Design a protein around this ligand. Structure first.
Ligand code: UTP
Ligand code: MG
Ligand code: MG
Ligand code: NA
Length: 327
DNA sequence: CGGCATACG
DNA sequence: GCCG
């Protein structure tokens, strides 16, 4: 079992679901307390379990696995012995965890805002609605639409959206293309949002595109919220439903075709997979990876990639399709 | 011990 | 919290 998640396939469904979910609760709780390092270790240990070929049934099977030390091993030990880990259950029912989860789930509210509201005594969404003067417009939209945004987006919803985005993109710039990224590209059946990547085959033609796309979607009455030159937009869309509609989060990113493999890799995820790949690139290969390119800081050169396959090869890694990047 | 991913809105 |  290699130490980095980008060195091993991780499928969407696996054989250690209960154990991985428990460790992810502790990772989430560590993030709420500001401990990025603890969050990473618990996330990494969970991801190791997702990569195993069969269920863990005995503690001895953790011996030698990366990211299992005294704490994560004890958690697994208790789940194997009793079906429950007391530390996890204590976190689950705690007011701090439940409120921080509730608040950070809001579009426009992160850990720091949630923590400040928690310390001020706020606990419920109606607590926030009663003091709307303390909310940004983004937070107001996230709070108004919170119920719909709490409903999973279905793969059935994604096809309909991609068609309307393609129509607007085609009027804004004929020949421009729309690619589904994020969790749906990794094979997820549900999501919290829909993520799209837009480009054009002629380098440079994509400049100025996203404002033209957003103006056209807004004119069609499909935009319930957006932030407005720019190249990323995090929006709330109106999606049709039987006799009505629902609000859906949609993310649009524009990249030049020269950078498209890097952007596709970066926005396909998973989040942990990309953090691990970027850490691997820098620490093991001395190369700096981001959504624009792969930089050699010694030669001061960028690696020209024509595909995601090219990027894995340049990092010395076996290629993983998106469905195996579910770290 | 240091390190823990990344850049745009 | 764990790795190197
Ligand atoms: O902190 C972050 C968030 C997101 N991303 C990059 O953006 C992509 C989309 O980020 P999303 O938050 O949309 O996640 P997801 O699609 O993987 O899962 P859902 O909760 O939406 O079902 C992620 O898969 C990752 O590639 C990061 O690199 N870092
Ligand atoms: Mg997504
Ligand atoms: Mg998204
Ligand atoms: Na949030």
């Amino acid at each position: 079992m290699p130490a980095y998640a980008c060195q091993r396939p991780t499928p969407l469904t696996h054989h250690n679901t209960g154990l991985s979910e428990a460790l992810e609760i502790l990772a989430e709780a560590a993030g709420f307390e500001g401990s990025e390092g603890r969050l990473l270790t618990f996330c990494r240990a969970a991801s190791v379990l997702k990569a195993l070929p069969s269920p863990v049934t005995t503690l001895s099977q953790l011996q030698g696995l990366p990211h299992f030390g005294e704490h994560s091993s004890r958690v697994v030990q208790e789940l194997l012995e009793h079906g429950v880990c007391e530390e996890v259950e204590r976190v689950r029912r705690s007011e701090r965890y439940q409120t921080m989860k509730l608040f950070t789930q809001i579009f426009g509210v992160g850990v720091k805002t949630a923590d400040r509201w928690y310390r001020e005594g706020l606990r419920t969404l109606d607590d926030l609605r009663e003091q709307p003067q303390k909310l940004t417009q983004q937070q107001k939209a996230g709070l108004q639409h919170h119920q719909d945004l709490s409903t999973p987006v279905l793969r059935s919803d994604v096809d309909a959206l991609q068609q309307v985005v393609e129509e607007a993109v085609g009027q804004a710039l004929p020949g421009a293309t729309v690619t589904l990224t994020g969790g749906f590209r990794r094979g997820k059946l549900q999501g919290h949002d829909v993520d799209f990547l837009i480009t054009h085959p002629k380098e440079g033609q994509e400049a100025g595109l996203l404002p033209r796309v957003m103006c056209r979607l807004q004119d069609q009455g499909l935009i319930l919220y957006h932030q407005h030159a720019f190249e990323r937009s995090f929006c709330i869309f109106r999606l049709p439903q039987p006799g009505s509609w629902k609000a859906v989060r949609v993310d649009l990113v524009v990249a030049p075709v020269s950078q498209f493999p890097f952007a596709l890799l970066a926005w396909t995820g998973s989040k942990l997979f990309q953090r691990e790949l970027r850490r691997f690139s820098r620490k093991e290969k001395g190369l700096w990876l981001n959504s624009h390119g792969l930089f050699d800081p010694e030669q001061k050169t960028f690696f020209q990639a024509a595909s995601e396959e090219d990027i894995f090869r340049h990092l010395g890694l076996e290629y993983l399709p998106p469905e195996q990047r579910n770290a």
